[PDB]
Write a protein that binds this DNA or RNA. Structure first.
Lengths: 86, 164, 206, 195
RNA sequence: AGACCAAUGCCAUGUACGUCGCACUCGGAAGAC
RNA sequence: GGUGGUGCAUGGUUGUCGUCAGCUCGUGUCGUGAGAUGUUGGGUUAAGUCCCGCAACGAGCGCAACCCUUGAUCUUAGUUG
RNA sequence: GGUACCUAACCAGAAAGCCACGGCUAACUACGUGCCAGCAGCCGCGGUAAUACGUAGGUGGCAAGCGUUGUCCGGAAUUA
């Protein structure tokens, strides 16, 4: 077992590459399972928006996540997009 | 007189060319490719590169293209006057075609001319049909064209007496 | 023919056997036992990626550690599957077993995971140029001192097989002071069999 | 099914509607969905020629001939070509909105008529002369599809004019801009046929 | 500047080409002492 | 289930030149291009080993070293020697 | 010549084919065959995994026409 770790509940993914990020969002989801979080969020960018639509398809076919959803008005709207797992 | 790479420049690959070397171990295989670059208004260059593979080959070509450019004078979206291309059995005729005629050229000469963005031009291949000698002859051609105002300056005259 | 394997050359002088225990007069069945247990974890945990496994035989009760980072989900809510796989291991080995999982930082520059990756997008039908080129740049972005990748077989041209490689940095196989880590993986496609080899140089050992 | 197959052969819907691309955007044929080579310097403008061909449905000798009439026309060599297809009368009944597909247009101009400076028109050549008041009756005025044509509003541009009760209109003074170029990558036509 | 060597059976030999990065909200009463 | 063929479909393997000192690349020049220069010249070495020159400047696989053993000795530990 | 024209009613029913798909040059796969049968304007393909033979599907190009052949001019600045 590994016990030297703590896992955060959110992640910000602004201003960097597609195929660089998806390596470390799969790692981040695995970290969230090790800490057993039922819910997580990955903050993204706006301008190009390729990874913003790109990550959500990966979680849809990911083996551990059932859904990814946008934020509510009480949280701040599109300032967060949420992910929950199995 | 050298134009920097401050502008935006479009590129267009015209030919990837297989090249070979014979060595003691056998034949050795390499890739040359030439590209033409420019803007649609007045500046154009071309570039050549050699590498073992296509993408960094055309990359070497495109940096050499960013290095070398040449300006073309443009009197009313067409060339001013008569000019024949001339470099090493490369003979390219350029005639100041009238408006609305479009581009009328062969393959590589159209590839450089549309990337120059000239609207109405027509041409003919009279020299050899290898593309590098084509482009070299054509840019030697458009290097020779002059505006009317500087010719009037060399004359000590104005442009009216030279247009008429 | 070819070279010798760098890590096979470096076994015992720089490298561990990952089977550190000792048997005598039970060496044989002990040894084939380490083979089939490795087979079991290899085709069970192929989804979450495993590179290497070290087997300990403390008081003949077998003891296991498993590497790599993606089994962070094996460690997590899948404590149930950890227990279930361990029950199957004691079902296979008679005398029971105890297992541990070790996280690996920088899992990008581990040869087994690299080779499994290239085999995977070769099965997924990306071009071998694209696969090798993004992987090599990813490793030397991660901090590897020098990486050379291999591929051989019917690379699209089924009528004649060939081989292709790209490499930069330094890959000193002739120096035994160097640390090298070698993998091979066998990408199977509709064309037959496509071979993947990869080795990573990660600085010398003082 | 012509329209659907040619929409995915072509990459653009010929009708201008979003459908036939919404779930089959690649191509027909069993080798459709694979990533294809970029089209050649003959392929690209033959492809564009087939755009301009089948979003009317007209044939090739008629293409070459109205091309030469466009060339004989005193304006610029390409936009005269596209405005002549603008003035082709099934295009006129389309942009007057009575026809909903041009296969509706050809069938209906086989059926009905336009009496603007005519007596009975089956053939799409002509143009409205400016300044005459001849009008459509009976055979394209009172029947079932006659008001099914203008049951909904479809846009009739500035170089045309229209009213809906008797459903007739005329070519106005001059066509200028969208009639010049809706989206068509022009001059590939003239370089293709000038090869 | 220094002797003598003849021949090597029809085809067919390879590949090459193909990335894409940027996000968080606005504002009531309040005395004199 | 096939030791039922196809190494001229193949992966994984191995020999061979040859333990030969060669093999190449980035960037830049020259040619137009094929290509060249680096890698040639002087000297030197088992070695593209090294030095000095030189439109090249560098880099990599190479070579050498790093490993094992055998040669001389110090300290530790003296038993089943 | 009761022709064309003009009207009415019946039936979506009576009516699309040819050639090509290695490149030049738009369009790819399956099976059979195995220097055989064969294709071909040029370069050429086929000697058992043939997108080039022959089939089938699919695609492409044109259409009451489509391919082949012959002849003339261009391309051919190849009599300049």
């Amino acid at each position: 077992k590994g016990k030297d770790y703590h896992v955060s509940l959110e992640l910000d993914l602004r201003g960097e590459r597609y195929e660089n990020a998806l390596s470390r969002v799969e790692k981040y989801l695995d970290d969230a399972v090790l800490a057993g979080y039922p819910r997580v969020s990955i903050i993204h960018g706006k301008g190009t928006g390729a990874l913003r639509k790109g990550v959500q398809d990966l979680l849809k076919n990911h083996r551990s996540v059932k859904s990814s959803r946008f934020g509510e008005a009480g949280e701040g709207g599109s300032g967060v997009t949420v992910v929950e797992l199995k | 007189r050298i134009d920097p790479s401050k502008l935006e420049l479009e590129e267009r690959l015209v030919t990837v060319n297989r090249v070979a070397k014979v060595v003691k171990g056998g034949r050795r295989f390499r890739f040359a490719a030439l590209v033409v670059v420019g803007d649609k208004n007045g500046h154009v260059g071309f570039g050549t590169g050699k590498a073992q593979e296509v993408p960094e080959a055309i990359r070497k070509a495109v940096e050499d293209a960013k290095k070398n450019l040449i300006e073309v004078p443009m009197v009313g979206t067409t060339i001013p006057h008569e000019i024949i291309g001339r470099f090493g059995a490369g003979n390219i005729l350029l005639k100041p075609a009238s408006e609305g005629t479009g581009v009328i050229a062969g393959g590589p000469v159209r590839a450089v001319l549309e990337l120059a963005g000239v609207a109405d031009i027509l041409s003919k291949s009279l020299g050899s049909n290898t593309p590098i000698n084509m482009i070299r002859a054509t840019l030697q051609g458009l290097s020779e064209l002059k505006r009317a105002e500087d010719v009037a300056k060399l004359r000590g005259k104005s442009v009216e007496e030279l247009l008429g | 023919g070819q070279k010798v394997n760098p890590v096979g050359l470096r076994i015992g002088v720089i490298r561990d056997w990952e089977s550190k225990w000792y048997a005598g007069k039970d060496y044989a069945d002990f040894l084939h036992e380490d083979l089939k247990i490795r087979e079991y974890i290899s085709k069970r945990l192929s989804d979450a990626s495993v590179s290497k496994v070290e087997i300990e035989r403390a008081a003949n009760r077998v003891n296991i550690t498993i590497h790599t980072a993606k089994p962070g989900m094996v460690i997590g809510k899948g404590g149930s599957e950890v227990e279930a796989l361990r029950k199957a291991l004691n079902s296979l080995t008679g005398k029971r077993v105890h297992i541990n999982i070790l996280e690996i930082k920088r899992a990008d520059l581990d040869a087994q995971l690299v080779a499994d990756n290239i085999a995977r997008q070769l099965e997924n039908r990306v071009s071998f140029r694209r696969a090798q080129k993004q992987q090599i740049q990813r490793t030397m972005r991660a901090g590897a001192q020098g990486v050379k990748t291999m591929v051989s077989g019917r690379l699209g041209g089924a009528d004649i097989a060939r081989s292709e490689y790209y490499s930069e940095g330094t890959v000193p196989l002739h120096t035994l002071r160097a640390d090298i880590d070698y993998a091979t993986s066998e990408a199977d496609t509709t064309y037959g069999k496509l071979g993947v080899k990869v080795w990573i140089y990660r600085g010398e050992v003082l | 099914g012509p329209s659907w197959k040619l929409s995915r052969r072509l990459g653009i819907s010929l009708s201008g509607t979003g459908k036939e691309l919404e779930k089959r955007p690649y191509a027909p044929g069993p080798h459709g969905p694979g990533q294809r080579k970029k089209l050649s310097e003959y392929g690209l403008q033959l492809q564009e020629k087939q755009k301009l061909r089948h979003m009317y449905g007209v044939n090739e000798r008629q293409f070459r001939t109205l091309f030469d009439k466009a060339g004989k026309l005193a304006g610029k060599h390409g936009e005269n070509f596209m405005i002549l297809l603008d003035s082709r009368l099934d295009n006129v009944v389309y942009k007057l909105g009575l026809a909903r597909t041009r296969r509706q247009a050809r069938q209906l101009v086989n059926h009905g008529h336009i009496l603007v400076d005519g007596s009975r028109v089956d053939i799409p050549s002509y143009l409205v002369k400016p300044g005459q008041t001849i009008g459509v009756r009976e055979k394209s005025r009172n029947l079932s599809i006659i008001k099914e044509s203008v049951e909904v509003n479809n846009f009739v541009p500035e170089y045309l004019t229209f009213d809906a009760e008797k459903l007739e209109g005329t070519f106005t003074r001059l066509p200028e801009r969208s009639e010049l170029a809706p989206e068509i990558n022009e001059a590939l036509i003239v370089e293709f046929y000038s090869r």
